[PDB]
């Protein structure tokens, strides 16, 4: 009864791992599973170290692989991604399909969070959507996936000490309990805590500022500092902005950004990097260049 | 720089 599936996923992955999309009928099947498995998780996912924090990937499949040649591979090495799986890149499908396959399999070896892009609207607007058609003919694998996205947890807490979220801090959110009460089982709203969490950024203008993006706000040193001190956070790890250098510290080593998509959109000539939290939460960063294609 | 919603 147990060897009637866990043996098959192993294959699904082997396949995607060679960069060949699963079949429609198969996507749904995969997502269904991923569902049940994701329902059960909180909104502020508590996962114990040691792990590796990975930021944005944006369908850049090959550069994803490169990442893996750096931080090791699953399940051998623990991971934690912070949204933005699709869009921009040329191989969205494959990428997400994969990461999800991994979650449905090595259930506790990888942790994926929702990003400003796991939303129908942006996926339509910025790419993913079309790619689905372009590759599957209909627009079902899109639905199938846009729905899985809703069950993705919004944040992560490593050893109660480090906070993780795609975007950032929200006025409407003071505590971590203020987050466990929310209802993420819905499409990313245009305004509100949830939305903010996936859109908010770090600023040097001090104190909450209106975001020139269109959603979320621009918290600052003060804001950060209080947050940490409040809930008992030693570091807030987000990553939602292209940092030309792969990762960046700000607000006085309080909050850090980590872009994992190298040379972003295959245009932005930036470095990308990931952060490895060890057995005793130690900051060790690894910068990497776009995989020779 | 491609368009705000983010190069």
């Amino acid at each position: 009864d147990e060897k009637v599936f866990t043996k098959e996923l192993d294959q699904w992955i082997e396949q995607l791992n060679e960069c060949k999309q699963l079949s429609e009928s198969q996507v749904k099947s995969l997502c269904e599973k991923a569902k049940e498995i994701l329902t059960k998780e909180s909104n502020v996912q508590e996962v114990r170290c040691p792990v590796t924090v990975c930021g944005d990937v944006h369908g850049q499949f090959h550069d994803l692989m490169e990442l893996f040649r750096i931080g090791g591979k699953s399940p051998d090495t623990n991971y934690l991604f912070m949204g933005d799986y699709v869009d921009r890149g040329y191989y969205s499908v494959e990428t997400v399909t994969l990461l999800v396959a991994l979650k449905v399999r090595y259930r506790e070896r990888i942790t994926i969070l929702r990003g400003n892009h796991e939303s129908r609207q942006i996926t339509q607007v910025y790419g993913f959507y079309d790619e689905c058609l372009r590759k599957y003919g209909n627009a079902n694998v899109w639905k199938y996936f846009t729905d899985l996205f809703d069950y993705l947890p919004l944040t992560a807490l490593v050893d109660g000490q480090i906070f993780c979220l795609h975007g950032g801090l929200s006025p409407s959110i003071d505590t971590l309990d203020h987050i466990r009460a929310l209802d993420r089982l819905q499409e990313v709203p245009h305004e509100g805590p949830m939305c903010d969490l996936l859109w908010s950024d770090p600023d040097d203008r001090g104190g909450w500022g209106i975001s020139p993006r269109g959603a979320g706000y621009t918290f600052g040193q003060d804001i950060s500092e209080t947050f940490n001190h409040a809930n008992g956070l030693t570091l807030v790890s987000r990553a939602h902005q292209l940092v030309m250098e792969g990762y960046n510290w700000c607000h006085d080593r309080n909050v850090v950004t980590i872009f994992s998509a190298p040379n972003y959109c295959y245009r932005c000539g930036n470095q990308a990097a990931i952060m490895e939290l060890d057995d005793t939460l130690k900051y060790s960063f690894l910068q990497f260049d776009p995989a020779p294609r | 720089x491609l368009x705000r919603x983010x190069x």
Binding site: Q124, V125, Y129, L133, R134, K143, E187 | -
Partner: protein
């Protein structure tokens, strides 16, 4: 002195074969940067009205300062990349050329300077070589070329055939051979002017131009660039003759995108720009299939489209037409506007639709209800039987 018909034909020769490679940053001796700014304010600032001495020492000069084989592309392949996002590689020695264009422009642009001071000093061979050029330095390079080729066209009734024929040849290579080129956008503006002022009773080679060159351009996937200048041409063409309407609309309808939302939007948009000028008698030739499609759009799941589709309802003329022919149309749209709009996420089109219908009632109540009826009726049957 008072004999400059050897002061310039010696000056131009200075600026001509000059050629100074600006890809090493050495030999900073201006000379030319000024030698030209002069040959400019000289024929410009009314310092002249009679400098027509039989001489092409300008053309030669130009055609040796300009004519070269453009360098290898600086932007990536093209599959995973979108041209709109290519960083405009700037060509140095611009500050130099920038004048050779300025001058050569502020040349035959001026009055009293006949079309036979060039007629055989500006032959097809100059046209052609000139054309190729339409290829890279952020507009600048082009922009001038755009203008230049505009004026050389509307001055020598002899090259008209050529410039045209040759502009096609580029397009066909662009459309079928390599699907890459930069001046398509610029070129199309030039063809804007040209169409707009054709032979009132349209020579047949143009209808081919349109049907076999223009429409097919909507085929390429980088359309997101010349699309607008394109539409204009398509439209302008329909104003110079509304016969072509039926086949131009039947064109877009076939070439209609199917996995490239943005293009879908563009078509929709180019389509309205056409309805807007459609001719009653013609709107009847299309309509049926046109609206048969609009229907689908409305019932798309890509808000970006469905939204652009429904925006038709906020157009006097289009609505007007839809009314005079509300008979056959209302039924085609209905099933989708009345589509049981209770299974969406975009908590906005559901309202957006109500509003269309509402705008449909006010036009012909009876029809409205009568269809609502017909539908509901059919709708009923399918829910009964199809549940065995």
């Amino acid at each position: 002195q008072e004999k400059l018909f050897i002061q310039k034909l010696r000056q131009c020769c200075v600026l001509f074969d000059f050629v100074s490679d600006p890809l090493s940053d050495l030999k900073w001796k201006e000379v030319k940067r000024a030698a030209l700014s002069e040959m400019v304010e000289y024929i410009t600032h009314n310092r002249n009205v009679i400098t027509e001495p039989i001489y092409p020492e300008v053309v030669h000069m130009f055609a040796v300062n300009m004519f070269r084989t453009l360098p290898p592309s600086s932007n990536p392949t093209g599959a995973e990349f979108d041209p709109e996002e290519d960083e405009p590689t700037l060509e140095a020695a611009w500050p130099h050329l920038q004048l050779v264009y300025e001058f050569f422009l502020r040349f035959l642009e001026s009055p009293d300077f006949q079309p036979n001071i060039a007629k055989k000093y500006i032959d097809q061979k100059f046209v052609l070589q000139l054309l190729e050029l339409f290829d890279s330095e952020d507009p600048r390079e082009r922009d001038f070329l755009k203008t230049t080729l505009h004026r050389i066209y509307g001055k020598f009734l002899g090259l008209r055939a050529y410039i045209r024929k040759q502009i096609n040849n580029i397009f066909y290579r662009f459309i079928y051979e390599t699907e890459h080129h930069n001046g398509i956008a610029e070129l199309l503006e030039i063809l804007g002017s040209i169409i707009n002022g054709f032979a009132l009773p349209l020579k047949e080679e143009h209808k081919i131009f349109l049907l076999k060159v223009l429409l097919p351009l909507h085929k390429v996937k980088s359309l997101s660039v010349y699309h607008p200048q394109l539409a204009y041409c398509v439209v302008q063409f329909l104003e110079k003759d509304s016969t072509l309407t039926e086949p131009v609309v039947m064109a877009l309808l076939k070439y209609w995108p199917k996995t490239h939302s943005p293009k879908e939007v563009m078509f929709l948009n180019e389509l309205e720009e056409i309805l807007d000028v459609i001719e009653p008698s013609e709107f009847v030739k299309i309509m049926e299939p046109l609206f048969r499609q609009l229907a689908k759009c409305v019932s798309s799941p890509h808000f970006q489209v469905a939204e652009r589709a429904l925006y038709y309802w906020n157009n006097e003329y289009i609505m007007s037409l839809i009314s005079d022919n509300a008979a056959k149309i209302l039924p085609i749209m209905f099933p989708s506007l009345y589509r049981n709009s209770k299974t969406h996420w975009n908590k906005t089109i559901h309202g957006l639709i109500y509003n269309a219908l509402k705008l449909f009632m006010e036009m012909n109540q009876k029809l409205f209800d009568d269809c609502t009826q017909q539908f509901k009726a059919e709708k009923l049957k399918e829910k009964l039987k199809m549940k065995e």
